[PDB]
From a paper:
Overall, the structure of NmbA is organized into two domains, dominated by the canonical Class I MT Rossmann-like core domain. Across this core domain, six structural elements equivalent to the highly conserved Motifs I-VI are identified, confirming that NmbA is a SAM-binding enzyme. The active site is wedged between the Rossmann-like fold and the substrate-binding domain, with the SAM binding site located on the lower side of the cleft. The variable substrate-binding domain consists of a twisted β-sheet of four antiparallel strands, acting as a cap enclosing the active site. The Cap domain encloses the active site to form a narrow molecular basket, consequently forming a different overall structure and a tighter active site than predicted by the ab initio AlphaFold (AF) 3 model of CtNmbA. The N-terminal β'1 is directly followed by β'2, which proceeds on to α1. β'3-β′4 make up the second segment of the Cap domain (together with α'1 and an unmodelled region of 24 amino acids), following β5 of the 7BS sheet, and continuing to α5 of the C-terminal part of the protein. This Cap domain assembly results in a contorted and non-continuous four-stranded β-sheet of two subdivided segments, β'1-β′2 and β'3-β′4, where only the middle section of the β'1 and β'3 strands is connected through hydrogen bonds. Consequently, the correct organization of the β-strands according to the experimental structure results in a narrower and more rigid Cap domain, which is unlikely to undergo a conformational rearrangement upon catalysis. Structure-based docking calculations result in binding of BSH in the expected substrate binding pocket of NmbA, placing the N-atom of the BSH cysteine in proximity to the sulfonium group of SAM. The Cap domains could be rebuilt to avoid clashing between the two monomers and with a good fit to the electron density, except for residues 170–193, which did not show any electron density. PDBePISA was used to confirm that NmbA is a biological monomer, despite having two monomers in the asymmetric unit, since analysis of the protein interfaces did not reveal any specific interactions that could result in the formation of a stable quaternary structure.
Residue numbers in the entry: 13 to 169, 194 to 265
The structure:
């Protein structure tokens, strides 16, 4: 199975999103993040990246391929075990975490924290999203980066339902349906700017195209931790 789909349902409207393995969306996203943030994978000791929602494990593995120290976090044990197998099969070293973003804790800190492919805003209230932002800020090294990949709301025409369904080889079904708090660009900026971050760029796609509110498919914000005396 190379193809997977996301489905967005509002009350009257509907949007389908197509994802193919051969598109290499994960690598192109990682390449854009590395280029725009200036993170050098060749640097020693290697910088540390936390993929706070690895999903199947495609983009976290893409980070790890460049030589970065990658920790992958997801609530689904199946999706984590999928990422172990792929990393094991490619001889790639990765750490794995199964923590909720509202209470996620680590002993170490990170240089980059990546929340990619519309994995933000699943919670009951808006306050829980501000808590997660504050949590991510406390896990970053000084000058650390936070990359937030949100859908651009124009592409859906405050809560929409996002539905994903996966099938194992034998046919076993895995259902991933969520509520998604939909943030305008202003709201996404206000969320990060008042969370301790400074937004450095916004891009409209995984190739780095400029974000246009009225036309872009993606709203990927790349933010950097403000300085503290």
């Amino acid at each position: 199975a190379r193809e997977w789909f996301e489905e967005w349902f509002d009350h009257p409207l509907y949007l389908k999103v197509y994802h193919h393995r051969d598109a290499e969306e994960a690598e192109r996203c990682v390449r854009t993040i590395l280029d725009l943030t200036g993170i050098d994978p060749a640097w020693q000791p290697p910088h540390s990246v936390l993929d706070i929602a690895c999903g199947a494990g495609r983009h976290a593995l893409s980070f790890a391929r460049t030589g970065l120290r990658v920790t992958a976090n997801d609530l689904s044990p199946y999706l984590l075990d999928q990422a172990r197998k792929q990393a094991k099969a490619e001889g790639i070293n990765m750490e794995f975490s199964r923590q909720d973003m509202r209470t996620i804790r680590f002993e170490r800190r990170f240089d980059l924290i990546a929340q990619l492919f519309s994995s933000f805003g699943y919670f009951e209230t808006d306050q829980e999203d501000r808590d997660v932002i504050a949590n991510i800020a406390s896990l970053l090294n000084p000058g650390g980066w936070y990359v937030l990949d949100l859908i651009n709301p124009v592409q859906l025409k405050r809560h929409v339902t996002k539905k994903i369904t996966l099938h194992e080889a034998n046919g076993r079904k895995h259902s991933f349906t969520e509520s998604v708090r939909i943030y305008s660009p202003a709201e996404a900026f206000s969320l990060l700017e008042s969370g301790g971050f400074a937004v450095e760029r916004v891009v409209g796609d995984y190739e780095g195209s400029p974000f246009d509110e009225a036309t872009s498919p993606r709203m990927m914000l790349l933010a950097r931790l403000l300085v503290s005396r």
